[PDB]
């Protein structure tokens, strides 16, 4: 079922997104969490409408994530726990070193705030 469900996600995403570069499957894998990267940012509404289209096709709640507008923390959560379903490897590595290194700088930026909240 997982392999069949995975393909159905590939079809819907490749068919509704131009210049698709990466398809990721993070979170718990019910409840499905999917992240994608294209050459352009996705429209806020059009992405959500597609997530509900995925949600209707797989009969599960689906969260579609635009890696071009997603937060740096969320992007690190994808490169940490995640399954690359589609896309080249050079684009995968390009996105991993882009996010991990961005995350390392951010970790230095906000360490003062994190320590205040954690007493």
């Amino acid at each position: 079922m997982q392999q069949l469900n995975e393909n159905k996600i590939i079809k819907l995403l490749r068919d509704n997104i131009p210049k698709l570069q990466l398809i990721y499957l993070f979170g718990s894998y019910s409840d499905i969490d999917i992240a994608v990267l294209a050459a352009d940012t996705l429209d806020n509404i059009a992405r959500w409408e597609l997530a509900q289209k995925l949600a209707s096709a797989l009969d599960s709640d689906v969260d579609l994530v635009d890696l071009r507008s997603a937060s740096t923390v969320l992007c690190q959560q994808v490169v940490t726990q995640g399954k690359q379903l589609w896309g080249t490897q050079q684009d995968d590595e390009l996105f991993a070193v882009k996010t991990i290194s961005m995350y390392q700088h951010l970790q230095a930026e906000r360490q003062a705030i994190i320590d205040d909240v954690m007493a």
Partner: protein, 132 residues
């Protein structure tokens, strides 16, 4: 039936509440209190439609919905609602996620979209049930 008339009345009450709290939309995007009330009443509509949908499938033995979206699929498969109407209501099933998580700016343009172009889908759904 008492439970149907109450859920239908609840949907009508929450649409009135969403319209009043949102106003013309000028101060919605800037007042978290206005956003919370609109988001909350939007949730009450979703569960009330899901309750109505599961009731009809139970009263007419249409099937056993394994999911909330599947309950709308059964109503359309027996041609009680049009397939484009179920798709719009199934879009609302995912709207339950926006309230439990306070990612404000991400899906604030989304709640604005559903308040402008999707409240009528609730009005259509209760209309079909009133005909019955």
């Amino acid at each position: 039936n008492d439970i149907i008339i109450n859920k239908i009345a609840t949907i009508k009450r929450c649409i009135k509440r969403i319209q009043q709290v949102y106003g013309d939309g000028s101060q919605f995007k800037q007042d978290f209190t206005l956003q919370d009330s609109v988001i909350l009443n939007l949730q009450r509509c979703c569960e009330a439609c899901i309750d109505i949908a599961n009731h009809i499938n139970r009263q007419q033995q249409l099937g056993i919905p394994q999911s909330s979206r599947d309950s709308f699929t059964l109503l359309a498969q027996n041609n009680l609602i049009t397939q484009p109407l179920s798709d719009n209501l199934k879009k609302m099933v995912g709207l339950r996620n926006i309230a439990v998580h306070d990612y404000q700016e991400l899906n604030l343009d989304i709640v604005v979209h559903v308040v402008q172009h999707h409240l009528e889908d609730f009005e259509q759904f209760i209309d079909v049930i009133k005909a019955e």
